[PDB]
Design a protein around this nucleic acid. Structure first.
Ligand code: A1U
Ligand code: A1U
Lengths: 228, 226
DNA sequence: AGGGGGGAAATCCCCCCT
DNA sequence: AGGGGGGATTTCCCCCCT
């Protein structure tokens, strides 16, 4: 089939995420509309023939890291997953996970890079171990407000990753008794009786893949290590 | 631009992930090459016209959960995040996150669902939390047995000894003659340093498939599409 | 807000076994 | 693979102080 039917082409324009491809020079060959608007372009085709340096977004300050990641995918043939935290022309900070894989020509030779970004909230981090543990006994599956202060959010964040009170008190510059007060305030807001129950309720309400706004402070583009 | 160029079509066939779409009845309209192979169809066109019940895969045992999630997307218009744990015709257990969104038509009416799955059995992104801590100033060859890998996985996700013992069906004393051996071959002096070191060796990406023993298809969350 | 006392319970990590 | 003993050190969660 040298052609896609028109309904399949509608899938092309509707797939989720922020994605496209670049050639061996990391100059854009195609970007979808989602990525175009995220990077500040009403017409996603204006990305074509631009590099990451030439885009009207604060992400251009990280263009070198993107290209370094692209060169690694191109030379090694391995695919990678990148954590990205940046401010965007819409005025807010966003965290993404960008998958990067070799883009191959009609005969298998590498001709560039394919990127695919997902918003962090469409990904799973701590909910993975939360549910692997639940496979002992039997649970049930049925899907279904609350406001936290800046420090309440940071403490919850560190709790869900298993950081102990001695660790949390050191990294936040406060007393261990101060942390206990925040665990109590969090235990109250979630309607939890114990700390272990607080962890459970918070993971069920999505906090396992939430980075609190107060920690979207510095631009970052790191390749997360995998074992091939 | 009512036509894609042929190189834009090459991107369509190579886009990463396991994805495709289904109509209002959850009958497969399209499935990409990666998904067809994951399910057991060497040629993905064979997916078309089938439902989740009719796939040559043990995942067909959860087809009703799939269609339930499908109907929820059709009903609400939300995007839905599903955790999936299943055995597949390649003889292995896998852990995927499938994202499901409405599939719309020319006038915007919902005509089915789009699924998009990513394998994280060996590409888990746990290290995200560690990277956020370091960048914000809130932080400071190996061969493992199957049982050691389990304990390490549970430590990396912050589980406590009582929790790890209950999960693994052994005593805490045994979950110590394991943390001890992990502390050794990682060269860590404290359980804290073992977590940090292992995270930097990339073990946050691993899900020990010895812990993948029951099929699971559960909705983790959903959200509005702006 | 940030910091604290105190006591039951749990952890951490040394040592010991089949 | 699966178990402990024991003791220094911390959680844990109820009170409480500026
Ligand atoms: C936001 C972002 C991060 N990495 C990339 O490679 C691109 C193209 N965009
Ligand atoms: C493996 C899998 C899980 N959920 C789905 O909806 C599909 C189509 N496949």
């Amino acid at each position: 089939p040298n052609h896609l039917t028109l309904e399949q082409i509608s899938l092309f324009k509707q797939l989720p995420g922020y994605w496209g491809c670049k050639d061996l020079n990391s100059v854009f060959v195609y970007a979808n509309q989602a990525y175009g608007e995220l990077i500040g372009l009403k017409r996603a085709e204006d990305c074509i023939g631009r590099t990451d340096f030439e885009m009207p977004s604060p992400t251009a300050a990280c263009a070198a890291e993107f290209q370094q990641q692209d060169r690694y995918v191109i030379e090694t043939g391995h695919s990678v997953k990148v954590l990205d935290i940046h401010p965007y022309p819409d005025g807010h900070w966003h965290a993404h996970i960008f998958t990067k894989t070799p883009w191959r020509d009609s005969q298998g030779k590498i001709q560039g890079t394919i990127f695919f970004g997902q918003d962090l909230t469409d990904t799973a981090i701590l909910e993975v171990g939360h549910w692997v543990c639940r496979a002992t006994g039997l649970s049930t599956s049925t899907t279904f407000t609350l406001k936290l202060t800046a420090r309440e959010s940071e403490v919850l964040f560190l709790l869900l990753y298993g950081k102990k009170p001695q660790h949390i008190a050191r990294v936040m510059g406060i007393s261990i008794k101060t942390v206990e007060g925040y665990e109590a305030k969090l235990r109250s807001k979630f309607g939890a009786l114990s700390k272990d129950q607080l962890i459970d309720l918070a993971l069920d309400r999505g906090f396992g893949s939430v980075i609190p706004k107060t920690l979207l402070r510095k631009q970052l583009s790191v390749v997360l290590s995998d074992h091939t």
